[PDB]
């Protein structure tokens, strides 16, 4: 599908609770949700080939992934993983992750276009974050 | 002397184990001194008046003394203190610090104009941080 283009937030509903559940204090949180209450995201996209760069003040990151062909990541809290990105359907890739670094929760991700529309969804344990996009 | 301007760090020695011996953990001194490698410091002053703007990624401070005349900030660590600033000498501030939370380290700081170069001192029990600023 097209997933490629700049896109603005619409909505999100559940990141407090999200860093809360990966274990960031509230010091950190309070900056984080802040910060990433108005991230840009410009997204390239050839096929199966996808650039993903999410830039927010406190924090940009520039992923480059093939979908079926896992990759080394961070998970949202800035921990190290290889992460498995799989059509779940036509227009959504479920992001299977893993820490390398021993302890954590059972993390993922999937971004899913809707209708000129990208649900992007962040889990962590029950947890589930969605935070909505919107071309700009 | 004229502390006044903007700086920015060239190098820093034991900010690592200063907040080791804070009693910070390993997960959250691995996001303080990444942060805190990339501070920026805007310094007004006025004869004895200053105003100290401590600014970086995940926290930033702004404290306003007169020398002499005592304060209440925080100690590195996010404590709540009350300090003392003192002109130890022509261009060096010495402020001693006590935790109004009970237990703690004998925390102190010391600010210096080298020579167009601003040695900052964090003591913490025998453990010394430097941090040397240069005129932006
Ligand atoms: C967790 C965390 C941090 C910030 C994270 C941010 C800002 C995440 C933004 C995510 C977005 C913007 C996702 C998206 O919408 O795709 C900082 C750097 C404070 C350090 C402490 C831990
Ligand atoms: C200790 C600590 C934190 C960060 C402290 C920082 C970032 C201090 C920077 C000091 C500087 C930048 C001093 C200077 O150079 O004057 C955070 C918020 C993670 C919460 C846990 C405890």
Same mark, same amino acid.
């Given at each position: ?9 619409? &909505? ?24 990433? &209450? ?16 999410? &830039? ?81």
């Amino acid at each position: 599908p097209n997933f490629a283009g700049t896109w603005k937030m619409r &909505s999100s509903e559940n990141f407090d609770e999200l860093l809360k559940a990966l274990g960031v204090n509230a010091m950190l949180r309070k900056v984080a949700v802040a910060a990433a &209450s108005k991230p840009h995201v410009e997204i390239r996209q050839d096929g199966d080939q996808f650039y993903i760069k999410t &830039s927010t003040t406190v924090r940009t990151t520039e992923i480059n992934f093939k979908v079926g062909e896992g990759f080394e990541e961070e998970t949202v809290d800035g921990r190290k993983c290889r992460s498995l990105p799989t059509w779940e359907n036509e227009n959504k890739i479920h992001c299977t992750q893993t820490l390398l670094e021993g302890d954590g929760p059972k993390t993922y991700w999937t971004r899913e276009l809707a209708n000129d529309e990208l649900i992007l969804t962040f889990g962590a344990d029950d947890v589930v974050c969605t935070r909505i996009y919107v071309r700009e």
